Amino acid sequence: NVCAVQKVIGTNRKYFTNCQRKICGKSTVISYECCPGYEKVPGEKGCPAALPLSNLYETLGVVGSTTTQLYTDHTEKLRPEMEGPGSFTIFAPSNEAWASLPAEVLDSLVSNVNIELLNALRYHMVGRRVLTDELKHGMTLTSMYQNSNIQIHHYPNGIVTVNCARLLKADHHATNGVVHLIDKVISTITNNIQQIIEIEDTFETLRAAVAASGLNTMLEGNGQYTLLAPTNEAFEKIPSETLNRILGDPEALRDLLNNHILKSAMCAEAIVAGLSVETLEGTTLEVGCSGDMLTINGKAIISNKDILATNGVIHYIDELLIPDSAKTLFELAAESDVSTAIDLFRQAGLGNHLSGSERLTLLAPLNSVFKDGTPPIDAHTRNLLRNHIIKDQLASKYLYHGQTLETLGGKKLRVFVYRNSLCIENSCIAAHDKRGRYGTLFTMDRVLTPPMGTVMDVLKGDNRFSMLVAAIQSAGLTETLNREGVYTVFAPTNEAFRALPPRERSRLLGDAKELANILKYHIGDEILVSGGIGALVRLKSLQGDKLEVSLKNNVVSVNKEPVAEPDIMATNGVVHVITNVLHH
């Protein structure tokens, strides 16, 4: 028989439930009264006695809706109907609700009490008894004023709403019906979302965008939406070149308008905590609240909440919500996790690829790659960057093994797709794609090191592996580590060969075919860059037995023996540098 109130400290807003920690970021205190209609006797057992039912007019005073009671009484015609025959509900505004009306609208009501005040009170009423049992999301009650509909919603969290007024105290039975207490005075709903946009002067840039895009027919139509409508002042915070480029292009335009529209009508006093919501374009937004401010992604950019329409709810927003798919590469990458990278592109002359409509894919590494320093701008940097800019617009989820990607600097880089990572040359994808209108940003964990020759060119140009190229020659393996292939050479240095045991180097020297078998064991038949090693991967060697290739604590190991220098790229493989020679 017991109930509870939770109240935010330093406020007036209270939520009247049965018997959540914070709400809109503000701490709560919970206070126990018991449910409207029952009394405390002298002590006894904890709300014993129920009060008698009174009829709907007197029930108004019992719930605390004395202004609604006073206004009803001063019409001389609704009060006798309220205390006589029938079955009724009234969604009765609180005392604070009438006082929160604008002076100009409340004067209009109380100066004509037999028409406009009576019409207002009749619109809050339904000619049948309707409990919150009968209230489910999306349904329309018929009011007693001129058959006008009342919009009610019922959100997951338990908040009932009635024309986007929160229902405060529910289900107070009358002898001829029920009384509900709501916190707004509500009014008739006569316009669709399209029709409001064509009336308000604050939306003339919005109405033209809708007109250019052909979304008028949708916004005239049925079903429920939320419009995060941008004012003219929102469109003026966007620089002219950026905005005209979006609005000019039909795809970018419809992506923009759909990023301002939700699939269900939700309204502001239903928002009590963080709720991720998708727009029609596909982007998730973070809708919260801080005080009585609505917040979008933690920004109090909503200046006018709960503007009502027959096909949904409009909230006015102050900043345009431009999605990734309407942005250029520069707009989607400059104030982000690849900020250091994009500054290097523009300083090295390559900025005009990123700033317009060129269909590109960008491989920009993370900012933690450049924590220890940044390379200087020269010929060699701006040629290397020019090879991180790939022709055509790509999606990484659609890349395939042994795909080749042309750069703007003439190279062809190889896509290697492994089970837990995707790699282009040595570099691997570190975060999700950012798909813009014209180009897409791939987010990388290394600066990439493109191949500059063959496996034999790596080894003959480096003096650590001169005993290895001699063994490769003496096993007849030069001509095949130099033609086209996909190898993984675990290449032992000179000090590895001079480390060899007597019985193993005697098997190396005394038969050229046994030397061929030991060197073919060192060579994988796939390309396995370090970014494609999981916990452990088995790798078929050209001898035929498998190699055990792990990555623990950022060191590649092969059969539990360490790689000193991973990922030296080559036009027909990858070279990893090992410090000793593998056995059998």
Numbering used by the authors: 47 to 65, 70 to 634
What does the paper behind this entry write?
Among the most frequent pathogenic mutations are R124H and R555W, both associated with granular corneal dystrophy (GCD) characterized by the early-onset formation of amorphous aggregates. A striking feature found in both the R124H and R555W structures and involving their mutated residues is a crystal packing interface between the FAS1-1 and FAS1-4 domains of different TGFBIp molecules, where residue 124 interacts with residue 555 in a second TGFBIp molecule (i.e., His124 and Arg555 in R124H, Arg124 and Trp555 in R555W). In the R124H structure, the FAS1-1 His124 is in direct contact with Arg555 through a side-chain hydrogen bond. His124 also engages in a second water-bridged interaction with the main chain of Met517. The side chain of Tyr121 also forms a hydrogen bond with the main chain of Leu559 in the second TGFBIp molecule. In addition, multiple hydrophobic interactions involving side chains of Tyr121, Leu120, Met517, Phe547, Leu550, and Leu559 surround His124 and Arg555. A comparison of all available structures reveals that the R124H mutation has no influence on the structure for the FAS1-1 domain, whereas in both the R124H and the R555W structures, the α-helix harboring residue 555 is shifted relative to the position of the helix in the wildtype structure. Instead, the position of the α-helix is likely to be determined by the intermolecular contact with the FAS1-1 domain. The Arg124 and Arg555 residues in wildtype TGFBIp do not permit this intermolecular interface due to size and electrostatic repulsion between the two arginines.
The principal constituent of the protein deposits is one of the most abundant proteins in the extracellular matrix (ECM) of the human cornea, transforming growth factor-β–induced protein (TGFBIp). The function of corneal TGFBIp is elusive, but its ability to bind both integrins and ECM molecules indicates a role in cell adhesion. TGFBIp consists of an N-terminal CROPT domain followed by four fasciclin 1 (FAS1) domains (FAS1-1, FAS1-2, FAS1-3, and FAS1-4). The X-ray crystal structure of wildtype TGFBIp reveals an elongated banana-shaped molecule with the five domains arranged like pearls on a curved string.
